[PDB]
Amino acid sequence: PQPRKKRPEDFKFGKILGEGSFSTVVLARELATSREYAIKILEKRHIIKENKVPYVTRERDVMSRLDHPFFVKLYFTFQDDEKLYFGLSYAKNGELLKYIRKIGSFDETCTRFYTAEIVSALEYLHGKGIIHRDLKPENILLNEDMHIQITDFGTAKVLSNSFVGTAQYVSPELLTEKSACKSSDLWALGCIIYQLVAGLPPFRAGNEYLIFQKIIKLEYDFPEKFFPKARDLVEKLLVLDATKRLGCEEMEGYGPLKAHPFFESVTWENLHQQTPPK
Ligand SMILES: CN(C)CCCn1cc(C2=C(c3c[nH]c4ccccc34)C(=O)NC2=O)c2ccccc21
């Protein structure tokens, strides 16, 4: 016996946090409780016309399965005659990409802390047989406590090859076999760790085709003063042979990955309870 289904009038919608091709996320305050939520609004007709029902269904069905501090929580859903509403946690501190730009380049203490939270959050995701398929700093929010909260699960996939995330994070197997697996998220991770230290992602070029070209030839390099243990880590994630990436079952999973020297001082059992380095 769950709470009465909620409805638009139960809210006071405010500013639009963002707009996508198929949806709009708007900050709303629930009148009855003063709770502030990020409500994602999708227009049924548009979804139907562009054949996205499988995607909206999936996004909903994945988020309902997640119950972990490093993921945006789906509190509720409801719909009217024209739209679909998803009540989501409202991460007050924006996205990780904003910070990367804002401060430019993370030092080692922050690079290590944030990477760890991400590794820790994927281990959970991948433990449930789910792959994100579009991991990036824009999709890794920061709550008011500055801990991470990953979102954007519409493109996710539950295990038992129709999508491609953002070009600069696309794995090479995705560009040759047309099929993503856990490996693709580990590749993205490697890219992100590189981006935290260097200030920018590893593969960059004038258009997408040129980016894809670099990815499959593994064409990138590290700056001169890139933390050595971080570099080593990235070199073990950005590996063309998917089955040889730290974290993959073929490489014996997250045990080895979390054991990397780069994470020597990390206490994995409760990152959520530690204080993020300011
Ligand atoms: C990449 N952009 C457009 C924003 C970051 C990605 N993103 C944030 C969010 C979320 C939040 C956002 C938090 N700030 C935002 C600004 C623009 C759009 C969304 C948000 C939020 O508080 N909770 C979210 O789930 C989100 C939800 C579904 C799909 C992608 C989402």
Curated annotation (Swiss-Prot):
Phosphothreonine occurs at T275
Q: Which residues form the active site?
A: D134
Molecular function GO labels: 3-phosphoinositide-dependent protein kinase activity; ATP binding; phospholipase activator activity; phospholipase binding; protein serine kinase activity; protein serine/threonine kinase activity
Q: Where in the cell is it found?
A: Cytoplasm; Nucleus; Cell membrane; Cell junction, Focal adhesion
Q: How is it modified after translation?
A: Phosphorylation on Ser-162 in the activation loop is required for full activity. PDPK1 itself can autophosphorylate Ser-162, leading to its own activation. Autophosphorylation is inhibited by the apoptotic C-terminus cleavage product of PKN2. Angiotensin II stimulates the tyrosine phosphorylation of PDPK1 in vascular smooth muscle in a calcium- and SRC-dependent manner.
Q: What is the effect of changing T275A?
A: Abolishes phosphorylation by MELK
Tissue range of expression?
A: Appears to be expressed ubiquitously.
A Gene Ontology biological process term: cell migration
Q: Which UniProt keywords apply?
A: Acetylation, Activator, ATP-binding, Cell junction, Cell membrane, Cytoplasm, Kinase, Membrane, Nucleotide-binding, Nucleus, Phosphoprotein, Serine/threonine-protein kinase, Transcription, Transcription regulation, Transferase, Ubl conjugation
Question: Annotated region PIF-pocket: where?
Answer: 42-86
Primary localization: cytoplasm
Q: Which residues carry this modification: N6-acetyllysine?
A: K225
Chain ranges of the Protein kinase domain: 11-263
Binding partners and assembly = Homodimer in its autoinhibited state. Active as monomer. Interacts with NPRL2, PPARG, PAK1, PTK2B, GRB14, PKN1 (via C-terminus), STRAP and IKKB. Interacts with SGK3 in a phosphorylation-dependent manner. The tyrosine-phosphorylated form interacts with PTPN6. The Ser-162 phosphorylated form interacts with YWHAH and YWHAQ. Binds INSR in response to insulin. Interacts (via PH domain) with SMAD3, SMAD4 and SMAD7.
Q: What is this protein called?
A: 3-phosphoinositide-dependent protein kinase 1
